[PDB]
Symmetry: none
Subunit: 81 residues, 18 copies
């Protein structure tokens, strides 16, 4: 298994419904409304970000900034930030 | 590639399920019920409007009127309206 | 576009979930239970009323009566009543 | 072309899957099961009714009453009712 | 058209999803599971009961008692009960 | 419109949450618990009573008796009681 | 025109594709696989049964048993059973 | 922003709980009990009056009467009375 | 119809959402999670128990003790207890 | 008519789509993928097992173990197990 | 990330339920009732305002007026006003 | 109506908040804490006692004992005690 | 190479199965059923219409009106309509 | 049935909303936030702990100390402490 | 279980409504208003301080400061101060 | 029957829709998106893993790590881990 | 083997049903409707584009543009874009 | 009986319709379109590869390569790869 996938799964397991709505709002400029309507967990949003080359194992800045905006520093400890 | 098709794809990417239902309702007089039942995205509706000569690169006032009724002025910005 | 459909869309845009519930209740004698279960917005109800000849541009007394029972005189203003 | 055939085509254009299933159910006594299993549109049903002399330009009562049972008075306006 | 088929259509029109589920549950001993998984409306169930000689214009007792178990006396008034 | 449905809607418009709870309690022997759990307004209860033949335009003593137990004589005035 | 042939034709007109597959399965021990592969309607199967002396105007027991296994009692009324 | 909405908001911000109960009592004949039970601020009552065409930017007599009955002349200075 | 099926239907009619959740919890050892996630009413649970030979007209002890654990003795009176 | 064929037909009439997929999965080591792709009912799978001498009137162990894996003990009562 | 989106998120995180209700009341003339019924946070209202071209990164007058009506000058310091 | 339910409603209408608290305390050994927390009126407690077979038209000694501990002899006169 | 044959080929290239079915239905009075059952593309129908002198480079009205009935105005632009 | 499951049901029956909140708080390190947001009763938490191998009929120490921290010794008597 | 979570639970047990209000007031600069409006016990505040990395088993200074400002030295004895 | 197939079936019967979606997310790097879109149960995913030599009776490490990531230790007891 | 064909197969393996629908829509001006109806996977579309000289090993700008419009940059990395 | 032909038959028996389509796509450069259109099973493709000297008992690199591109390592075990 990729450690990147396990890290994404662990991050997704620590996010609630309100946090998911906030993350969807903060991703409005990168993911279209039609695609955003189908997102029911952090895994789907991470998949769309992976497809758009906005999120990679070596490209994690956007995820860190999303987590900082949500004020989840405990989750940022997982990304080692 | 035709910029007209790219514009139509972009417009269809910004629309949700309720907006698609509203668009289907407002087109009841131009498209039959049998043809309207098969539409699952804005692309199918735009293609049918193209076939019936209701929508061309020089014929866009029906699309602008529909987008105005949907109260989506950001989407009218893409059509330069 | 037909002004009749624009008017119906505008009327449906001003109605809430409870108002839709009382609209469905007051139409129990004209629309069957099987068809009434599939209605999620006023657009579907208006389309069924159009299909059964209960609602036409020259046939609006049923709609005016339903809006009167809902005690929505601002909505009757749109129909000029 | 025959305006009878054009009228039949126009009627078949304004029908959905559910209406087709109900029309098939209400014609069980006149068409066999083997022939009814091949009907995928109103056109095939109309052709089979034509073959059995149930539907002619001078013989439209069965079509009229089938449309009445489906509560499609707008469709009956095409048949002058 | 037969008044029997019209009566069956009228009865099937006044039923919702839940009543259809109960009707399927209460007919488990006469219809196999493979045939019951293909019923999406009261019309299919009525046709299946017709094939097995369980429902005729002169043989309606199973229909009346199924309607009684669902506590639909208004529906029984259609069957004159 | 049926004046019966208008009367039922008017009666339901004058009832509060506690009165709805008392009505649900007093109807425990006629409506099952599963069906009683889904009632959020007097309209649902009245429709269920209509289905079970407990309430018709010529069948109103159950409604009058229930309103009498609620000590709502102003509401009995609407039913002419 | 033989009444037996007309009866066979009428029976075959009331059987669908699935029933034909079940009938072919139930006839595996009497008709070989190579011959069964060419059967596209009940008429071919009836002809093959006629050749093997399993089906005669005075010998209708196998057909009755096949119809009873398919649970088509309405079709058994045609064979007078 | 409508000056009417701002005026309504300013009026509502100067009314307390007892004043709200008195206003609800004085509005008993115009708003039903079921709707009155959901009013938790002057804004909900004002919106309900707006729906019933009892209160408009050009129709403010009822609001002045309500404020005079509450003996709030300071609030009447806002409506210029 | 079988009195056993009617009895099961009557028992399932007097159950609410919470009791269904408790019944699902107390049957974890006999039904898998995949099959339990598809149960939306007591009828589906009863059918699943029927398939596994856990509930027959001569085999009712599991149902009796499941009802006992929910403290529904009135329901046990239907099962003669 | 073979009692074995009638038993196989009765078993097949009690199996749904999901059960058919599970049975196909459990038969992967005996029937090839190309042959498994054409199976649309339990009858085809039973015939394929019949050809490979895995299923006979005197050889019913594999069918019993398949039914036990699906946890259909009611169906095992048909095989007398 | 757009600084505009981060500013909107920070504004929304400083508004309570009562402030949300007041903001919904003050936005009655621009957003329909059906759409207003689905707003559960400031983010949804901001999204609807963004769709309508009433709120843009270069168009912040309406938001300033809304904040001034709510008397949140501390929040107006975020918009630099 | 059952006179039993009318009697229970009348008894519940004569009780105050403190009396309800004492009734809930005295029923600690028969109703669980989870179920006791949801009781807001005597009707819910009476229904729970009815379900557990603690209270029937022929089983009223528990109710009489509870009313005697509350020192409400006027309420015991309604139960004829 | 004839521009008439090239035009017919270009028209036949922009048609799907459904439009071919409607074209066959609307030509029932000019082509027999025996000849229509052998048409698998628009080219066969065009050839048959050519043989019966219904379609020539100077005789296009039937093709024009057939394309009109299918609501293909873009296709009529090829025929210069 | 398992007396383990019966014991778990009995323990969950004697818990209130506040105790469930404390139980959720004290299990933060073993269950993720996403999974804890879906727990509405002690049964959900117990099943979740069962999945992670934290609670078995031979593994009851975590439950014992969770009950101890809530100061429920009467509940510990059920687990025989 | 973690001694840290047990300590937090013990601290939250010895607090009343007024102390919770003071704790909410003194944490205004670290938690938003929307998040603070949803705190009904010290557990929620502790959880949110945990998320923002303000409180860890190795980071307890802010908790000590909050307890000191409330003049609860007995509570500081639990934190070993 | 292979014990490996029975073990896979038993594992698949204990996984819900959410667990299946997490398993699909964790298998993104090994199974392509086109193939992943057709997976509707654990059996299909297990078949795809078997085809790619990622899962064998002697090769069960990937399945163990998948189950450990889902935190199903009870399911890991089935694989003897 | 041609690396071009392996690359095309790999690209087609990463595409879903919706992405195929958008690809077919964006190719409306180069491939006819009759040829587009027969495409069930990206392989057929790529073969048609190869046939019309729209796609060659030295001619890949159309493919790169189509992948860019689909917003699949990971799929552009395979084509080295 | 040649072991090479037995191996080819066994390989062809484990392939499905989609896998055959991908095999036909990957062999576009070696087999013409006219010869590829007549292939309905892997046996025909293998025979054509045998004729063109692309596949011999000592020449199996093309077959191994094709099976590797199909990601069928279990089928590569049959060829000992």
């Amino acid at each position: 298994m990729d450690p990147f996938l396990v890290l994404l799964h662990s991050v997704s397991s620590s996010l609630s419904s309100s946090e998911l709505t906030e993350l969807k709002f903060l991703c409005l400029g990168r993911v279209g409304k039609r695609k955003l309507e189908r997102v029911q967990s952090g895994l789907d949003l991470f998949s769309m970000l992976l497809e758009q080359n906005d999120l990679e194992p070596g490209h994690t800045e956007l995820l860190r900034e999303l987590l900082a905006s949500l004020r989840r520093h405990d989750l940022l400890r997982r990304v080692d930030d």
